[PDB]
């Protein structure tokens, strides 16, 4: 099919914050408030919720309790588009 | 305002629907009903509400052929094309995800 592969791949991280999540988490682990400190404007339901979904679909590792967040190599795996995206996005503002 | 780059990105193309339109129209031009029928969950309105964004924004043009009844035709801009190549990476990373699990 001819979309069907970006359809998935929207699935996986075209949700509110998601690729946002992972471009603050590439390199870095961080904890519920830290990222939620990046990204203000997010109920903190809905950022557990985003971190949540990306972890069932395993792009993103969970292991007084500390919970830290992580990229999966398989998570490392889609740095290259958010690298674009960011490279896209620089042109774009600083062009304007 | 953007603390970064990517959330502008985001702005211009992250909206539901934004970027597998742009996809769509790679390489083409379509009409309304073409889109529907291509995005088939979506409402009318949240498609046209998504168009108009994506027209504002200089990512796609929208061209009135005036027969009768008049055809609205879209298109990608130059600007919608320079993010084909990150689509074009998006789609094989997708495709690559698919073939296991």
Redesign the interface.
């Known amino acids: 099919n001819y979309?069907?592969?970006?359809?998935?791949?929207?699935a996986?991280i075209?949700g509110k914050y998601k690729?946002?999540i992972l471009?603050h988490l590439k390199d870095t682990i961080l904890r519920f408030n830290e990222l939620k400190k990046?990204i203000p404007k997010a109920t903190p339901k809905m950022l557990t919720q985003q971190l949540r979904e990306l972890e069932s679909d395993?792009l993103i590792i969970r292991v007084p309790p500390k919970v830290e967040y992580s990229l999966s190599d398989?998570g490392k795996?889609?740095i290259?588009?958010?690298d674009?995206?960011?490279?896209?996005?620089?042109?774009?503002?600083e062009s304007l």
């Open positions: 979309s069907c592969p970006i359809e998935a791949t929207l996986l075209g690729t946002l471009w990046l395993g398989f795996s889609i290259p588009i958010l674009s995206m960011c490279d896209w996005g620089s042109d774009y503002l």
